[model samples]
Target chain A: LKEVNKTCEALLFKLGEKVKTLEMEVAKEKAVCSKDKESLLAGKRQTEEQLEACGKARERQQQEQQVTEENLRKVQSLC
Target chain B: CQEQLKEVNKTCEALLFKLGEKVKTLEMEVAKEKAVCSKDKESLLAGKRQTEEQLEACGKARERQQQEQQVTEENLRKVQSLC
Candidate 1:
């Protein structure tokens, strides 16, 4: 009986240790998930800014192209 | 110059859209992985509990058997004294 009790105690201790290890691993995974989420959001914001800059550039280019075409047409008529 | 700027803008927009799509896909994948991790942890905890319960039951049964054997031995000794 003494031996049985000793063995049970040892087994319980080992099981507890294993559970702690698993808990640590779960915590680590959660941290990694959080970091990934933050990175994803940051990347999305950067992309949105780039898209806005592209739209502005496109609009500026269209305005410039129209003015240049009109000037060329007037100069050709004078010639 | 205007055509060049227009081309540049079109290229930038395409690149930005592609990057956004890639990031969105990655986010979805990460979410899925997180869900799987959570489920795995839960199942592991459940398994550990089941194992501990089984171990406890086994220990109790062994203790009971030892106690019964001791009682039987004591009764035999008393019967021998009577004889």
Candidate 2:
């Protein structure tokens, strides 16, 4: 029947519109995910660098502390 | 002509069904992406906090070492003067 054909065509048109809108939304979300992933990786790198630098500094300070203690003890013994 | 109209109707219904499925799939994709982004943000915050804690401890250790060095320098000077 013509009426049935017309109804099906109208429903198809509406569904086409819905699919277009959803596809556009999906595109935006993908872009956002890409940006967020980059930012997360950058943050991870920064944290790693900070941790490495701190460890090196602590190592140097401990060595200096040992040297200072030895010098103080030797000088005190002489006095 | 009427028979062809029936085929048109069937084709339209199939297309509608496929488009509805596509819309649902896209919506789910968006939701999943948002969840992943949120988890990444949480990981970033945890990393930052841990780094801060490590830096704080490092700073305190450095401060103590500096004080000890100052004290030893003063004592060495005094002991030498006593001689």
Candidate 3:
């Protein structure tokens, strides 16, 4: 019985230690996940903004091209 | 000049659209992974608590067994003395 008690106590202690280690690992993983999420969100936002800017620039360029083509046609008709 | 401007505009627009799509895909993937991580975190916490509780219960059971054994030993000794 004495031996049994000693062994059980040792097993309990080991189990408790393992639980603590797992808890620590979980916490570390959670923190890293949170940081990654923030970075991903920021990158996504920046990409969307860049896309919007590029779309506007493309639209302006197309409009300018149309006006230039019209002016060239007019000059050719006069010639 | 017109052709060059059109080509540049097309290239820029295509690149921007591709980048935007990639970002959206990555965002969805990250969100999925985040949800998985949250579930894993919850399971880990529950597992830790369950293990701790089992250990405590085992410790208490061992203590009770030890007390019972001690009482049996005392009784045996008294009976031997009477003989």
Chain A TM-scores, candidates in order: 0.78, 0.85, 0.88
Best by TM-score: 2
Docking quality of model 1: it rates as incorrect
- Between candidates 2 and 3, name the one with more favorable TM-score: 2
TM-score of model 3 (first chain only) = 0.88
Error of 1 at B49 (Å): 0.8
Q: Poorest 10 consecutive residues of model 1 chain A by lDDT?
A: A1-10
When 1 and 2 are scored with lDDT, the better candidate is 2
DockQ of 1: 0.01
Error of 3 at B12 (Å): 71
> Which tens-of-lDDT digit does each residue in B1-83 have in candidate 1?
66765665565456555655655565565567779866755665565556555555555655565565566556555555544
**TM-score of the first chain in candidate 2 relative to the native first chain:** 0.85
**TM-scores for candidates 1 onward, in order:** 0.48, 0.79, 0.48
Candidate topping lDDT: 2
- The 10 consecutive residues of candidate 2 chain B with the worst lDDT sum are B47-56
Clashing pairs in 1: none
lDDT of 1 by residue, A1-79 (tens): 3454455446555655655655565567778766755665565556555555555655565565556555555555554
Report the lDDT tens digits of candidate 2 across residue range A6-38.
887788788778878888877887787778768
